Design an enzyme around this catalytic site. Structure first.
Site, mmCIF file in Angstrom:
data_model
loop_
_atom_site.group_PDB
_atom_site.id
_atom_site.type_symbol
_atom_site.label_atom_id
_atom_site.label_comp_id
_atom_site.label_asym_id
_atom_site.label_seq_id
_atom_site.Cartn_x
_atom_site.Cartn_y
_atom_site.Cartn_z
ATOM 1 N N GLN A 117 50.544 42.429 31.080
ATOM 2 C CA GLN A 117 51.482 43.241 30.134
ATOM 3 C C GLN A 117 52.187 42.612 28.868
ATOM 4 O OE1 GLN A 117 52.231 47.250 32.250
ATOM 5 N NE2 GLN A 117 52.318 45.028 34.328
HETATM 6 N N1 GTP Z 1 32.588 47.426 32.626
HETATM 7 C C1 GTP Z 1 33.806 46.993 33.524
HETATM 8 N N2 GTP Z 1 35.022 46.605 33.621
HETATM 9 C C2 GTP Z 1 35.560 46.322 34.727
HETATM 10 C C3 GTP Z 1 36.101 44.877 35.091
HETATM 11 N N3 GTP Z 1 36.537 44.367 35.237
HETATM 12 C C4 GTP Z 1 36.875 45.543 34.586
HETATM 13 N N4 GTP Z 1 37.065 46.532 34.401
HETATM 14 C C5 GTP Z 1 37.456 46.872 33.727
HETATM 15 O O1 GTP Z 1 39.153 47.002 34.173
HETATM 16 C C6 GTP Z 1 40.469 47.687 34.578
HETATM 17 C C7 GTP Z 1 41.555 47.448 35.186
HETATM 18 O O2 GTP Z 1 42.434 46.547 34.921
HETATM 19 P P1 GTP Z 1 42.567 45.709 35.670
HETATM 20 O O3 GTP Z 1 41.914 45.254 36.802
HETATM 21 O O4 GTP Z 1 44.183 46.331 36.046
HETATM 22 O O5 GTP Z 1 43.257 43.853 34.970
HETATM 23 P P2 GTP Z 1 44.316 43.141 34.813
HETATM 24 O O6 GTP Z 1 44.108 42.235 33.281
HETATM 25 O O7 GTP Z 1 44.110 42.499 36.151
HETATM 26 O O8 GTP Z 1 45.725 44.237 34.691
HETATM 27 P P3 GTP Z 1 47.169 43.762 34.706
HETATM 28 O O9 GTP Z 1 47.167 42.536 36.162
HETATM 29 O O10 GTP Z 1 48.410 45.060 34.205
HETATM 30 O O11 GTP Z 1 47.779 42.319 33.951
HETATM 31 C C8 GTP Z 1 39.508 48.900 34.658
HETATM 32 O O12 GTP Z 1 39.537 49.712 33.639
HETATM 33 C C9 GTP Z 1 37.759 48.597 35.286
HETATM 34 O O13 GTP Z 1 37.022 49.049 34.645
HETATM 35 C C10 GTP Z 1 33.867 44.535 34.659
HETATM 36 O O14 GTP Z 1 33.597 43.801 35.547
HETATM 37 N N5 GTP Z 1 33.073 46.003 34.270
HETATM 38 MG MG MG Z 2 47.285 47.090 32.628
#
Ligand code: GTP
Ligand code: MG
Ligand code: GTP
Ligand code: GTP
Ligand code: GTP
Ligand code: MG
Ligand code: MG
Ligand code: MG
Lengths: 164, 164, 164, 164
Positions: A57
């Site tokens: 973030q």
């Molecule tokens: N289509 C698809 N979407 C994914 C996949 N992996 C994650 N997402 C998307 O990622 C989004 C969630 O974001 P996060 O899991 O919080 O990723 P993050 O970078 O760890 O977020 P922060 O911890 O806040 O930095 C969801 O809306 C999912 O749809 C994937 O393998 N395929």
């Molecule tokens: Mg996020």
């Protein structure tokens, strides 16, 4: 008994938490945006991985500076369908890897969300990230689909075998 | 340090070798039908799995009788799209699990090839196999796509946690 | 240490798997409709809980009778928004609790999905399930939202306090 | 305990990854085209081989110059069926072997995909690559089929015999 410290960095919507928990637990999970960091341990072949999931973030971008120390490999997770922010992704990657502490770190580009209709391929990503300017260390680009686990363990194997 | 012996049986074209080598090596492999058996060792959480891949060709069907001894869990891989041989699959499953040595074995039904246009869901699989007749031991059906590794480690975790 | 065996029963779309995974891992796990069953151990205070997670399909209802033996507590999970099948839920609950083996079991009614637009309130759950006419055993109704974890530990604490 | 550093270079569709994986694992694997590179260790007779597997896309050709240092043997993999582009392979091979650092490397020409219906023969490859005009070093042309291990171990033996 070998050990390796891995730092996971990247912009938001990259999917680092999904990757880490699909590695540890083997199941896909619904995530709440991390305002700090997560630390999980994943054992694979004969090496114990201490993986640091520092949140991406905008309000906690300076937090990355406190976890460069002791890093052997860097996993830069990229949303391969978020073409609008690949420039910021490139800027952040090159700001990370050109520090004094991260000089010895292995660079693994993890292109996530390959199943999306407008997903970018690894070659277009190596073009957009300027990876051809990295010539003093090992690097690699691994396409993946994190919700199914497609390509996680192959990238982990690459990280294991290319550590010298 | 825990250990568990797993026996992999099923009809031909089930994809057991692909499963075993996607677990062991991490990559999808090109295979030649085994006329004997393959033995690989895969450590996952804290348990060391000795997995026996006995071929399913017609000419080596009686070979299955020599690897029942000492089995803790049975993985019966089923082609969920080849509807024409699910009856033979049912016959073989019930011939295996009703022996004297396999009475204490855990039954994991592994429905492979879920991405095919006419893939059977686990409900149709439990209906065609008659798994509702198994009421003296633990069993479970796990859909999967072995070429991508979708669901392998979930079934491995289930085998690990349901051993009592 | 203290131990207690818990059996989880209910209709389809009740959310038993989500509840068990939230109790065990603290994560919101994306689930697949299950045939067969899982067995998982959850430690909370000083009591070790062996929880049985059996599927809720109609074709696997007879499998419930083979896991009544030795039950100390029964968790009957109800979709509190599926008002059209609360009568089926009542039928199943009264068929379970009036058997011979389940008469000494502590009954916890787990009204899940409390945040849905047309969710029923716990008093309506008591009236529809006929719990107001049960005067011969120890029971209690607890609403919950399994994805967030609200209401799970309160019900677990109630089960712990009433078991002696 | 002998050691030897080998650099694998070539154009696209050469098959270097399949060769390296057949040498390391003994099994043909499904490959994803690399845009970075791999470093793998293969032990064969009494000599430990450190093999570098660099991609062959046009945009990553300049990266080859940063891995010439310390090379004992060069494996130039040629698609023996790509008659249209063997002149490009000739140009690149002569640009590689006439540099200052690669002058003392043992040259092994690895003609892969020999089983294709329009495959070129090693004599034609000698004539096309201009190897008939190289009289100042040791070189050798060898047909191969990477998916079966045809000629891989023989070429490794030739590299071992000529290294002193
Ligand atoms: N289509 C698809 N979407 C994914 C996949 N992996 C994650 N997402 C998307 O990622 C989004 C969630 O974001 P996060 O899991 O919080 O990723 P993050 O970078 O760890 O977020 P922060 O911890 O806040 O930095 C969801 O809306 C999912 O749809 C994937 O393998 N395929
Ligand atoms: Mg996020
Ligand atoms: N689509 C798809 N096909 C698969 C998958 N796994 C295996 N196959 C198919 O299975 C075929 C090969 O059979 P094997 O993997 O050798 O199975 P096997 O029963 O062990 O064969 P033998 O040992 O020779 O008797 C190939 O044609 C694959 O296309 C999968 O996960 N998805
Ligand atoms: N909103 C909301 N939905 C939930 C919650 N828990 C489960 N669900 C829903 O429940 C559905 C999945 O059902 P399961 O978790 O498999 O419940 P189950 O009874 O074990 O299903 P079977 O094993 O097939 O009988 C998903 O569509 C979820 O949306 C919750 O806490 N809140
Ligand atoms: N028939 C046949 N095809 C081969 C053989 N070896 C490689 N191939 C073909 O080569 C293609 C794969 O390309 P790669 O082997 O990954 O070549 P590459 O340029 O080094 O790829 P990167 O390492 O990612 O850069 C596949 O389509 C195979 O069919 C072989 O021995 N026989
Ligand atoms: Mg076969
Ligand atoms: Mg369940
Ligand atoms: Mg390669």
């Amino acid at each position: 008994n070998k050990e390796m410290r891995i730092l996971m960095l990247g912009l938001d919507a990259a999917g680092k938490t999904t990757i880490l928990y699909k590695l540890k637990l083997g199941q896909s999970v619904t995530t709440i945006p991390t305002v700090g960091f997560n630390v999980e341990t994943v054992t694979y072949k004969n090496v114990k991985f201490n993986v640091w999931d520092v949140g991406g973030q905008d309000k906690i971008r300076p937090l990355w500076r406190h976890y460069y120390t002791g890093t052997q490999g860097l996993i830069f997770v990229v949303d391969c369908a978020d073409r609008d922010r690949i420039d910021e992704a490139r800027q952040e990657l090159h700001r990370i890897i050109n520090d004094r502490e991260m000089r010895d770190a292995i660079i693994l580009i993890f292109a996530n969300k390959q199943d999306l209709p407008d997903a970018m391929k690894p070659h277009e990503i190596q073009e957009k990230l300027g990876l051809t300017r990295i010539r003093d260390r090992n690097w690699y680009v691994q396409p993946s689909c994190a919700t199914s686990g497609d390509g996680l363990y192959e990238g982990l194997t690459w990280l294991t075998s290319n550590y010298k």
